[PDB]
Design a protein around this ligand. Structure first.
Ligand SMILES: N=C(N)c1ccc(O)c(/C=N\CC/N=C/c2cc(C(=N)N)ccc2O)c1
Ligand SMILES: [Ca+2]
Length: 223
């Protein structure tokens, strides 16, 4: 997260860190046994880490649980990142508490202008690299569809939306992939892609979660 702020320990209880020997992507807890992330974050041997703040220090509220199954969206296209969403089932149910909580799925899509909370352990530098260790946060509005498609001609699909600031300075970045975009208490987006980080007229692109609620619900209920 570039141009953001330190969230504060466990202030985003649904935020998870996917670990394969190191933090590599974010994710969102949707219920005690399931996490939603980006399909481009797929890999074997994933351990889901909940109740995390500083990812390099055991602070007392963590829960490390191995993934038992991963399900990349049936229509995921790695070249265009269309349908960049995947579900991860935990080998054992997470113990829900004030620091480890699920985030509700949307029942309808969000509108342009709506303010959302984006979080993650990604790079905090617009030019260069610096990884935080503690969770970073960023308030950003959903941009107009036209603004989004104008910034990324021919690349934006109905399953994507942009959020952030066209002036630049605030945006998600490498390492935030798979993380949550929450608006009005609903998980409306997943950190998917962008061009550089916090660059002018290059807002972040997010997976439009409201388009996948039926698939998410049906998939979890059948697995
Ligand atoms: N808003 C932006 N310009 C910005 C730019 C790019 C984007 O990545 C994002 C949103 N995604 C972050 C996840 N990155 C980690 C990651 C880790 C791995 C990995 N461990 N192998 C692979 C792909 C990965 O993407 C935002
Ligand atoms: Ca920790």
């Amino acid at each position: 997260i570039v141009g953001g702020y330190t969230c504060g320990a466990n202030t985003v209880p649904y935020q998870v860190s996917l670990n394969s020997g190191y933090h590599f992507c974010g994710g969102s807890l949707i219920n005690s046994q399931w996490v939603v992330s980006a399909a481009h974050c797929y890999k074997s041997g994933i351990q889901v880490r909940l109740g995390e703040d500083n990812i390099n220090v055991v602070e007392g509220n963590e829960q490390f649980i191995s993934a038992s199954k991963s399900i990349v969206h049936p229509s995921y296209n790695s070249n265009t990142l269309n349908n960049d969403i995947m579900l991860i089932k935990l080998k054992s149910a997470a113990s829900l508490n004030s620091r480890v909580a699920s985030i509700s799925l949307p029942t309808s899509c969000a509108s342009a202008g709506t303010q959302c909370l984006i979080s993650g352990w990604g790079n905090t530098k617009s030019s260069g690299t610096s990884y935080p260790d503690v969770l970073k946060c960023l308030k950003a509005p959903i941009l107009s569809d036209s603004s989004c498609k104008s910034a990324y001609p021919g690349q934006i699909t109905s399953n994507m939306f942009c959020a952030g600031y066209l002036e630049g300075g605030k945006d998600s970045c490498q390492g935030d992939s798979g993380g949550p975009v929450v608006c009005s208490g609903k998980l409306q987006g997943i950190v998917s892609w962008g061009s550089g980080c916090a660059q002018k007229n290059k807002p972040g692109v997010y997976t439009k979660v409201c388009n996948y609620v039926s698939w998410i619900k049906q998939t979890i209920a059948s697995n």
